Design a protein around this ligand. Structure first.
Ligand SMILES: *Cc1c(COP(=O)(O)O)cnc(C)c1O
Ligand SMILES: *Cc1c(COP(=O)(O)O)cnc(C)c1O
Lengths: 399, 403
């Protein structure tokens, strides 16, 4: 046995989800657009999953659009916002400096191409959180969208989405006084789902990104769009056959949708359970890491007075020989990462997100991200703490 | 009890494909970008599938980019072309595209959108009203100084007619030498091969194309797809529509759907190993079907997939039985065994407007209004053909009988 502690990179599929995908491949294989029963059958599994996703986040079914994953969902909100601005001088966006590559790069690309302007608001180097005032201060007459991740994938810090939406709703009243349209709010909730409750009315957002493989579901995803086509405009990236009410054309992937729906049902039924278990194992892990390493360890996810994911513990051990990727190379049991899985090609570099959060360069170079899951046990925490002790001995030696 | 004859709309998964998706879900669930053995094993399934797709089309693994399906592949080539024309100019005004009038919605609509938004110009070349085929000389005659992409489907989904892709590529290759001499941009060629894969040999060296769309669910694979780009990064550029984590060499970012890719690769392996058997089986069944339809309906039937001098898919038989009461959707509604369609699946929401594709092909409206598309598959038998010819006779009688 290896001990997996990289659930923020991806999650295995729950057996009920594997079953739903398999059943659908075999039994609901018809084109969902087809007029005969074989078609109507797959369409029913898709409608049921649409309702499952909406229930998971406290929304309505018609507010859910299925996509190929979180990258597409995030690019779609951004693309749609540009088109909306042109159907209403460049559109302006507000986001923060620790967003996932699928929010940061499409925005950097719009800037390079001179299509839009973007303020990448820095996060507080004190609490690793973006500050609401900095967002509000960045609004311009051409600002069209605020996009801020619900939870950070490397630190686990929760951003104040609710407060941002509330304050942006107020500003929107005054903006209308000057005939200016509304600033909308999107949150990338990839890392919050199945780890803490997510409710769109509580968050106040107009768009929200859902990523299946972060909550034991298949590698597809969706986009919540508040009262889509009525309350909130959505302009497509793709053109074709009319599926997803023309917001996302292409023959629907029924099996993946069935599994995302089943995965969503498990989050609706058990989210608090998953949360409590993750918290229990993560706090135990931090207790053990401090007990074994003392003043040599730094807990990079424990920013003062801010909420954080229940399962995440990003940490560093003091020492020149303890660069994160070298510590993990020496471990024999633990499976973890030094940052985003998609950043695995530059692991010898300190995480720019940790740098953005005010973590010193020498501390960031040594960072390892442990993210626990629904099955993780205290016996497993003990095994990887022991593994980390031997790895640190091999590299830094005794101190 | 039912007999499926709508394989051009979608195909069931072969058992081996299902097994491949299922094992991959259980055993290769790791993030392919991860630096530990869990992530390297999924990357390996992904690598093997990429070679499977390349072998199926006569190409090389590095020239295959996984996508979410045919719609994305098609939209991606069009988007990349716009970006490419612009990068070339900057590095040095609207790009021009040539297509035909019977393409799938995922090629026609993105192009129409480009014209509405004044981003590109596009010539929608009409197919021949004699042979339902777009003609090489008409495509060549539509070439402009700013033409940069010709995109023509290899096979039409409604009629089954094969377009002259190889000759189009050969003629464009000769034309490109003349454009280079004067400094004009080269014209690239893409073919949407959705309906040809698994039904006839598809070889990119024979076809001469620069891009080719692959759609899994048309060849008994999962609902994802791929895009072939010739010599990507060396002979042909590919500018992404999506931005993110670096997957698919940044041409198509996002964590890879390993199970779907596994299924797609296994589906491609079956095509590579058995395409000739599938093709010949389909042709025998479809030709028996046309014989039987003519034997039963005589001069009342019109075979709409029998154009002169052109090749067609081996499994497709679009037909109309004459009569005011035999509109396609009405015939199928009375059928008790046959499962087929009146046109493409995505046009199901307007089963009563006579097919624009058939009208473009010269089929008169009285015949087009009554068209039904039968498309047979790997498992279809001659006995099943007889069951549905009987089903059709019964349906026709109900429709024309007492009130
Ligand atoms: C099926 C098909 C496609 C792809 O459509 P999807 O709904 O994305 O699977 C593209 N072109 C043709 C001609 C097709 O038949
Ligand atoms: C996983 C994740 C995504 C989605 O990435 P994909 O590779 O498309 O699954 C988006 N945002 C965040 C914060 C994530 O952690």
């Amino acid at each position: 046995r290896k001990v997996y502690m990289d659930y923020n990179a991806t999650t295995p599929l729950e057996p009920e989800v594997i079953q739903a995908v398999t059943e659908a491949m075999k039994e609901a294989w018809g084109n969902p657009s087809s007029s005969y029963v074989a078609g109507r059958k797959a369409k029913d599994i898709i409608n049921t999953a649409r309702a499952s996703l909406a229930k998971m986040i406290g929304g309505k079914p018609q507010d859910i659009i299925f996509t190929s994953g979180g990258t597409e969902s995030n690019n779609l909100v951004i693309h749609s916002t540009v088109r909306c601005f042109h159907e209403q001088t460049r559109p302006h966006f507000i986001t923060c400096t620790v967003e996932h590559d699928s929010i940061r790069l499409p925005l950097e690309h719009l800037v390079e191409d001179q299509v839009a302007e973007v303020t990448f608001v820095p996060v507080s180097k004190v609490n690793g959180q973006v500050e609401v005032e900095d967002i509000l201060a960045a609004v311009r007459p051409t600002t069209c969208l605020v996009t801020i991740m619900l939870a950070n994938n490397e630190t686990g810090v929760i951003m104040p989405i609710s407060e941002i939406s509330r304050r942006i709703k107020a500003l929107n009243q005054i903006r209308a006084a000057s005939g200016l349209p509304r600033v909308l709010v999107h949150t990338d909730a990839a890392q919050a789902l199945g780890k803490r409750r997510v409710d769109v009315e509580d968050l106040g957002v107009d768009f929200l990104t859902i990523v299946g493989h972060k909550f034991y579901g298949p590698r597809i995803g969706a986009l919540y769009v508040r009262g889509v086509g009525k309350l909130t405009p959505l302009y497509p990236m793709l053109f074709g056959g009319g599926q997803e009410r023309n917001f996302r054309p292409g023959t629907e992937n029924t099996p993946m949708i069935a599994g995302l729906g089943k995965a969503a049902d498990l989050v609706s039924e058990n989210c608090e359970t998953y949360e409590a278990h993750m918290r229990d194992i993560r706090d135990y892990l931090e207790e053990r890491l401090e007990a074994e390493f003392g003043k040599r360890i730094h807990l990079n996810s424990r920013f003062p007075g801010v909420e954080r994911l229940p399962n995440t513990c990003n940490f560093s051990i003091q020492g020149s020989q303890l660069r994160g990727y070298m510590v993990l190379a020496q471990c024999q049991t633990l499976l973890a990462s030094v940052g985003a899985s998609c950043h695995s090609d530059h692991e010898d570099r300190p995480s720019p997100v940790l740098l953005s959060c005010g973590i010193p360069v020498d501390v960031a170079r040594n960072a390892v991200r442990l993210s626990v899951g629904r099955s993780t046990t205290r016996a497993e925490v003990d095994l990887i703490v022991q593994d980390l002790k031997q790895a640190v001995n091999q590299l830094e030696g005794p101190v």
